[PDB]
Automatic annotation (TrEMBL), chain A:
Keywords: Hydrolase, Metal-binding, tRNA processing, Zinc
CMP/dCMP-type deaminase domain ranges (all copies): 4-109
MF-aspect GO terms: tRNA-specific adenosine-34 deaminase activity; zinc ion binding
Protein name stated in the entry: tRNA-specific adenosine deaminase
Organism: Escherichia coli
Length: 147, 144
């Protein structure tokens, strides 16, 4: 019936990214959307959980699998405040999601577009709320806005 | 405590995945000749697209060591790790991945392009071919 904008979901991901920031983790937030509903939320928790896979995007994808009772999450859209790493990019491929939408650019997702392990095609949208996403990462890494 | 010794344990784990009707891949994470992580493929039955054998072993390893970084560990996998699991090995900063048989479909190499990329912070060493035929026999029996 209705669809929220990209910016609406990115703003929720930005809220989640601050949860990681407050816990002294790389401040990335992610939200997985199917039929205009949240089926997954994530923020970075690798350090506190002792889990090298606990990135924001992975946590949202795992929550989606639990919501759908299906390791395949067809036609879902994953929002991430930061360009996903190679581990998370492969997880989306195996998840068979429809679209990834990320804020600021960064291995990373762009480096692995035509990698031989890409049986499925995921659509890419970038730049949504780029300024807000970059502000979190620059404040966490003490870098200028140029980076 | 040879490569073949650890691969044989991963082969035992790969049959657990077979018994669960999953793509039969097993993995064992070894640090200083001790097992710190064991995993087998469970992605379909667990509704988790990340629940591959290699990730399951690394996740248990992170909790056994109380550290998401698993320095100097060696990960044994009966099957060539996918891109997702290769990315997990990089972030875990393990020393070496040892796998049996390659993926005939997705391989160009593909794992080297991701694990041993020269412009990367960490390089994971690759050893392949350990009990490859035994690893392949499990996967072929599962496919048709
Ligand atoms: Zn990631
Ligand atoms: Zn994998």
């Amino acid at each position: 019936e209705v669809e929220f904008s990209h910016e609406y979901w990115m703003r929720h991901a930005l809220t989640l990214a601050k949860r990681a920031r407050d816990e002294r983790e790389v401040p990335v937030g992610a939200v997985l959307v199917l039929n205009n509903r949240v089926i997954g939320e994530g923020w970075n928790r690798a350090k506190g959980l002792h889990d090298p896979t606990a990135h924001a995007e992975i946590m949202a994808l795992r929550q989606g699998g639990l919501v759908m009772q299906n390791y395949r999450l067809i036609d879902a859209t994953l929002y991430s405040t930061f360009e996903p790493c190679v581990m998370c990019a492969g997880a989306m491929i195996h998840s068979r999601i429809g679209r990834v939408v990320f804020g600021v650019r960064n291995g990373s997702l762009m480096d692995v577009l035509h990698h031989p392990g890409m049986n499925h095609r995921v659509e890419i949208t970038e730049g949504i709320l780029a300024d807000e996403c970059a502000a979190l990462l620059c404040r966490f890494f003490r870098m200028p806005r140029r980076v």
